[PDB]
Design a protein around this ligand. Structure first.
Ligand SMILES: Nc1ncnc2c1ncn2[C@@H]1O[C@H](COP(=O)(O)OP(=O)(O)O)[C@@H](O)[C@H]1O
Ligand SMILES: [Mg+2]
Lengths: 42, 55, 34
């Protein structure tokens, strides 16, 4: 068409990225406890 | 890796227990009652009843 | 006449090894605010 349906808010995208970041952080946190060579957390 | 250190420690514990039980033990039957007195004195050495352990 | 019961040394080794393994397995620590 041309221009396209313009997004006004950008807060939804911020929420998506914040949620993705938090989830990846939790994973990265418990990523070294995986497998036989994985270690414990206190 | 800590797993490898742990495996080695476990093995060394097992083999140290076995080596003690097979080579480093003395039967108190061969020694009689003075063995008991000596074991008690050994435990009491380092305590405030050390030199009096004899009694 | 310096004798110790075998159980003393044996249990010392077993318990020390288990404690060392337990502490040596920790690679992270999360201390939560009370
Ligand atoms: N002896 C082993 N050698 C190689 N991979 C292993 C061994 N034991 C477990 N795994 C792998 O390690 C992965 C994680 O297992 P684990 O640490 O218990 O975490 P989870 O409980 O999430 O499965 C499993 O997907 C398994 O495929
Ligand atoms: Mg003592």
């Amino acid at each position: 068409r041309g221009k396209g349906a313009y997004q006004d808010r950008d807060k939804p995208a911020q929420i998506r990225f914040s949620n993705i970041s938090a989830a990846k952080a939790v994973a990265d946190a418990i990523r070294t406890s995986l497998g036989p060579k994985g270690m414990d957390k206190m | 890796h800590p797993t490898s250190v742990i495996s080695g420690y476990r093995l060394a514990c097992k083999e140290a227990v076995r080596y003690i039980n097979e080579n480093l033990i003395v039967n108190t039957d061969e020694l009689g009652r003075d063995c008991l007195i000596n074991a008690a004195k050994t435990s009491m050495s380092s305590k405030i009843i050390g030199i009096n352990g004899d009694f | 006449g310096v004798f110790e019961p075998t159980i003393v040394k044996v249990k010392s080794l077993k318990f020390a090894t288990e404690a060392a393994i337990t502490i040596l397995r920790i690679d992270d620590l999360i201390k939560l605010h009370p």
